[PDB]
RNA sequence: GCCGGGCAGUUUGACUGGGGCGGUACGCGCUCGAAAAGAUAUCGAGCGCGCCCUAUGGCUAUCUCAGCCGGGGACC
């Protein structure tokens, strides 16, 4: 029972590309005073047309979570801007956070997205014993059974501090 | 020392469907030709080397990618 609920295992925030704290080493710093942590990541993808042909990129992504760090964060994170904070929006797997799409080669590949709900926001709902599947060792699969759904997705969060929408 | 076919002695290669012009199959490496051991020709087919690297060598420790999807073409 208990296990079978679902609760938020690692969110993680996240910003856009292009190199970030031009001026000086900012846009980190939100993110900063935010969340708690301050990662970075870097790019590869070298010739952009506009964007840099560095290879090793500043590009500023960077967040996580953990254990209570979101919740405390993923509060007065949620109740931001969703002009339908859910529906569509997310989909089979349980969580998401998207806008509008476009077209692009998807589908095979990890699925990092582009995808940006708020500063893309990536809330990852899994219930269960899962991190069967995500451990190193025999991995093992999630069922497909206890897996999440997007309509028991799109509750639990909704059940607490704000409307589906 | 300089100029110096005025004059003398010579050289000016080989391969090559004759020779010449072109080319080099003139030294060397791989696949195929090559006929399931080995060896095997043509100006046979495809194509390379006449270097570069103080790490792009040596050992040891430790060891996840493309791409796609979802959440905030950079990044998380």
């Known amino acids: 029972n208990p296990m079978?609920?679902?609760?938020?295992?690692?969110?993680?925030?996240?910003?856009?590309?292009?190199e970030s704290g031009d001026r000086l080493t900012?846009?980190?710093?939100?993110?900063?005073?935010?969340?708690?942590?301050?990662?970075?990541?870097?790019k590869a993808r070298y010739t952009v047309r506009t964007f840099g042909i560095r290879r090793n990129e500043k590009i500023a992504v960077h967040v996580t979570v953990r254990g209570p760090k979101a919740e405390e964060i993923l509060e007065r994170g949620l109740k931001?801007?969703?002009?339908?904070?859910?529906?569509?929006?997310?989909?089979?797997?349980?969580?998401?956070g998207f806008?509008?799409?476009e077209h692009i080669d998807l589908?095979?590949?990890?699925?990092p997205s582009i995808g940006i709900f708020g500063m893309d926001?990536?809330?990852?709902?899994?219930?269960?014993?899962?991190?069967?599947?995500?451990?190193?060792?025999?991995?093992?699969?999630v069922g497909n059974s206890h897996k999440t759904t997007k309509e028991d997705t799109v509750s639990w969060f909704k059940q607490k501090y704000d409307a589906d929408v």
């Not at 859910?86 to 969580?95: K, L, Q, V």
């Open 4 to 18: 079978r609920d679902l609760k938020i295992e690692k969110l993680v925030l996240n910003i856009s590309v292009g």
């Open 80 to 96: 931001v801007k969703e002009y339908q904070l859910r529906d569509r929006n997310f989909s089979a797997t349980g969580n998401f």
């Open 121 to 141: 926001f990536y809330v990852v709902m899994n219930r269960p014993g899962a991190r069967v599947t995500r451990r190193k060792r025999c991995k093992g699969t």
């Open 107 to 111: 589908g095979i590949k990890y699925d």
């Open 99 to 101: 806008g509008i799409d």
């Open 26 to 42: 900012r846009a980190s710093k939100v993110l900063e005073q935010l969340s708690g942590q301050t990662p970075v990541q870097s």
